[PDB]
Amino acid sequence: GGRKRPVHKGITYGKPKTSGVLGMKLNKNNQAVAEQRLGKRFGNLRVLNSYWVNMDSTFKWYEVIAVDPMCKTIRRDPRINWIVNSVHKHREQRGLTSAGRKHRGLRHKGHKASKLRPSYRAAWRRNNRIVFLRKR
């Protein structure tokens, strides 16, 4: 379903533009949300990826793949031991998995993604900061 805006009694304030309660949509997709819930709950694991398996009228089920970074089999495997390094801790919380990249717009390149690369904030930073050259 769509996101309900969590305002008291469904009452908003300010300009009528922000007055919607039932029609706004979460800007993350549900796969990213499922990965984040898995990752938050079990902090000793590293979430790698997930995929769709089923859905109801009420529910969606996603199977999340996670890696134990302390297992010797993982640590001695050149194919997967990249995830042991601490820069990949809670990568799903930072939108770094495939679903997170999807809702970040990073499936696109070139002219369909110029305002969102390497991120929306990065492009806003380099498009909105005032540059003072030394000799100007």
Added chain:
Amino acid sequence: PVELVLWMPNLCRANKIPYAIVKDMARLGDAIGRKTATCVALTDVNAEDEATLKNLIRSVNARFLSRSDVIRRQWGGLQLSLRSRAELRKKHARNAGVDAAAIIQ
């Protein structure tokens, strides 16, 4: 998941390879000395078992390969519980002759 082998009888039928569906992947795993096995293919046997392999192929074909039209056609399920079947039985017994006077003869 059943999707691992749901296609295998069809693939065997298409290539005309005799196949059997048997019970208990765990008994198959027992045969090959493992915990479970999804499927086993016999490629060749020694001469002492050629006759047994041929008889096996014949009975297996009788159950599966020769019955491809029925197997492809037959929907299953739609089975009532014992309580439901007994209730239908009792109902048909109670109303056994309610319309006997409606018949002209």
Added chain:
Amino acid sequence: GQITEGCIVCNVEAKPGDRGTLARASGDYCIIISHNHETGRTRLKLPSGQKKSVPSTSRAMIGIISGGGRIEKPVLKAGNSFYRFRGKRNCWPKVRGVARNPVEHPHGGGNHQHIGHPSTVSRHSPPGQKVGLIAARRTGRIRGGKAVKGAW
């Protein structure tokens, strides 16, 4: 289903295994109207005057609920109302809506105490607006037969 028609019953199960949900207030009872041995349902007259059907497997107590006649004695005193509601809930005394200010009630305000709009309000009124006579079919002094209240 084991109780003869015309018998007076109380503590009546609306559903079998309910353990009693109908005719429990002091002096109240139900009357068994009829049985339908085919459908296995019993029709009964509730204290409100409505007639309801329940499965014949529902249990009833034979008789009327004790304590009848209570509402016949005038309370006479605000203190007696105070003690009556002491053991129930915090719902008394009652302040009329027209005695309130317009900030906290639709009936509030005015230089006279008055409801400035009809007090019959729609069934579809949102909470905070649904005060007064809620979805009234009629108002005023009831003349002649009192119609059975509730839904159809």
Added chain:
Amino acid sequence: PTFVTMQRKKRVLQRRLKVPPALNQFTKVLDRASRNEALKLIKKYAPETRKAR
């Protein structure tokens, strides 16, 4: 316990619904005697263990 009830109810629901043929075919197993004979023949030709290899 919840899992016991769930596996029983799963068998019930698999029986009550209309099973399409592709799945229904897996309830039509080989007979007992041929199953034992085939399993014995496969047991004759099992793979080598770790130590035999």
Added chain:
RNA sequence: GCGCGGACAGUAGAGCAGGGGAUCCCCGUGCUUGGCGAGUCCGCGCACCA
């Protein structure tokens, strides 16, 4: 602005204002343009960025 119903029923009859004899009958009386398509007034229910 879009759709409908109506200029009493219609495929020109009916109600009835004025008419002869004893309330009965009889004379009267009555939306446009085109070969069934395109306009005018009443209403209804609906559209509204110069």
Added chain:
RNA sequence: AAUUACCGAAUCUUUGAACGCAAACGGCGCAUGGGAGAAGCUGUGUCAUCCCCGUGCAUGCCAUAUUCUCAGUGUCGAA
């Protein structure tokens, strides 16, 4: 060297994520190692109750059991 500087060895009270249970309580436990120990016993050892100290003991998750103990009108199957 009560000098200074630096640093590899050590120490590091009550807490706090705080994690045996609690808490305006310097409180109360279970298991397990110790210590002290009156009266009786041959000053010595020994020691009930009481007392003191160490260690482990939250929840969840992963792996695992030289292959631990079980449960299921789940699926099989014995000989």
Added chain:
RNA sequence: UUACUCUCGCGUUGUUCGGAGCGGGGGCUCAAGAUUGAAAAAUGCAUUGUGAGUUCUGCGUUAAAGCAAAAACCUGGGGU
């Protein structure tokens, strides 16, 4: 126990009670106090009678109001 036969009896300041057992005689028991003594004079300071207050306790009307609970402890019913 012809106790209640045509005015029954007992008892409270007080609203009662009795063949579903009143009253009398004789007992059993509980609760408050008495009395005797041990403590205890070895201590304390420089005495044994009545009347008024006093709620420990005893006596087990408002109510559409009927006036907490548990630990702990006690006794029995069964069984050893």
Added chain:
RNA sequence: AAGAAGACCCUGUUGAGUUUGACUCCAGUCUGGCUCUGUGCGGCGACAUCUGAGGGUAGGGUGGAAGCGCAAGCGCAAAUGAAAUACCACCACUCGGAACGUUGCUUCACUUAUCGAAUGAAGAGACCAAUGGGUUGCGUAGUCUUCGGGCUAUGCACCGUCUAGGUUUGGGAGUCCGUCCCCCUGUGGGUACCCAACCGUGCUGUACUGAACCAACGGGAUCCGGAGUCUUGUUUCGAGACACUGCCAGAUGGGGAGUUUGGCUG
């Protein structure tokens, strides 16, 4: 005089509280559709295809085909029209049927989704027997076959079975009848039944304060029954594929939000 950048009054393209049938909206409510969502029977229709069966005034067309047709009629000629018919061929629009496929609604019978209750998920249903189930059978008749055996009807069988109590059909054997002791009497101890049939449905109690638990007992080598057995399985009951979940859509909506409510002016 002090106390306070007049609270009255006006101005400002400053507010806030409140109201409403101001402008612009939002929750809430309601309503439709899709979804959740399965089975089987029927009903009304729609689609495809065969095919009826007729037929502004009257004697619908539209074309080849003016001649053959067994017969022998329709004209290019009689009758009209807002249109003139032949022998082969030629149908307006309605009405009518299957017999198959699909299916849009819808009645009913279901039950596994789901919903509502209850319960410490504490005793469901059957055995009383199918329009039931099965290679973890046996026949028959068709119809297929990969030759091994299937499928569809059809039957026989196996799954598969026991009961309080009520009513009546057969069996003797101990002693109501009486018996077996002790004191004419009194008292104490027991049996006075078993099987089979139809009914019934799991049934030892009934029509102003008791006690009841950790069986005895009887068989087999500690089990067994006493305390029936079974499970295409749902804890039970009530609904039930709608009324419950999500999305989409319309109406309503001062309950609430935001904002506005000109100017000139003795």
Added chain:
RNA sequence: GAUGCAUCCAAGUGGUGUAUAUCGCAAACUGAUUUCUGCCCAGUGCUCUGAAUGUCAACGUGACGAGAUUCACCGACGCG
């Protein structure tokens, strides 16, 4: 009459009146007794009609078009 009425909550197998059950609960108005409480349903509300014989949403259905689309039909509460 409980799968309820009123109603809290951003949300859930969530929450209150409800440990309840019409002699109950929830929402208004009037303001002890006494004696009374007249006429008006046009308006605005509220309510029902088991015609909703007009009006709409999107969902469907058909037709035209190469297609985007265009048209037609169906379309519920409600309004009338």
Added chain:
RNA sequence: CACGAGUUGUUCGGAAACUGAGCACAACGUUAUAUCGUUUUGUUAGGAAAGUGAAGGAACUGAAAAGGGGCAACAGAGAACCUGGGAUUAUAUUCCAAAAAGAAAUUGCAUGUGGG
């Protein structure tokens, strides 16, 4: 203000160790977010939350027992001590020393006497 002192408990109050209006850890659910909700109407949680009386050959094994762990009263429940002192500068039902001024009550373990 400076210096130096002063608060003594088996029984007093609390806690060990009760329940109340209530709270909310766990569990589960929800939420983009747990820093949210449910959590006593006998009572958590789709919910497998009990870890040991016994025995039987000194600590190892295990029946039956339904509904997890806590907290919340210094005026409710509960709770074995009380007089005398010539005993302080200041504490005292807390201190007093064998004639404990002394008189008690009450726990937990052990030792004897005796039992029927």
Added chain:
RNA sequence: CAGUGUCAAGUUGGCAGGUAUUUGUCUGCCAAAGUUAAAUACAGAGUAGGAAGACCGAUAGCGAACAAGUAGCGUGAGCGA
């Protein structure tokens, strides 16, 4: 990009080629797993060292040149010489 509905194709293929559609040419590329150094940030961070200033000079410069997040205030969030 998100929710929901609906949901492909298979290199005779997809995606892109900044005016919607139906055609048929051309060009580039091959989504829906994953890892990766440097050049960039440090707009109220820290650790260990360094270098400076046309800056301020005790009412300035950090609130704080000093036993300063101190003394003091507030039920508290906080305030703060």
Added chain:
RNA sequence: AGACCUGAGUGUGGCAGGACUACCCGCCGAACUUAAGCAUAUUACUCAGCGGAGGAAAAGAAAACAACCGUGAUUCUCUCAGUGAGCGGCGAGCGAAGAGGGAACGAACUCGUUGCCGAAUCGGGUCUUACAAGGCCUUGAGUUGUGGCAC
């Protein structure tokens, strides 16, 4: 009997919660303000709020640009460019990209699939001076597929 496969108990070995948070990554998300009023717009995809990591993060090896005589992962700088692009009560305002000069640059690799193999793999004990990228053993895990090789 037993099996596997679904789920529990306990032992053993380990990990997560907290802090920091300038910069960085994901969400969430205003209003004052500007428009001389104000609702779209603006402020702003900002503040406040909830999460997460590092020494940087993120990005990154073309389903990229272009339309050329063609370029060739990412990031960053000047410039393109306050733009005869575009968005906008077309008002107030807003607003990039390719090419070009440059910084950096040893920049490239892995899986899955396909097809050839098929336990050659992992963990655990234990030897080698050795919780060896080694030997031996091992049903423990793994055939519901780990590991090798190839364009």
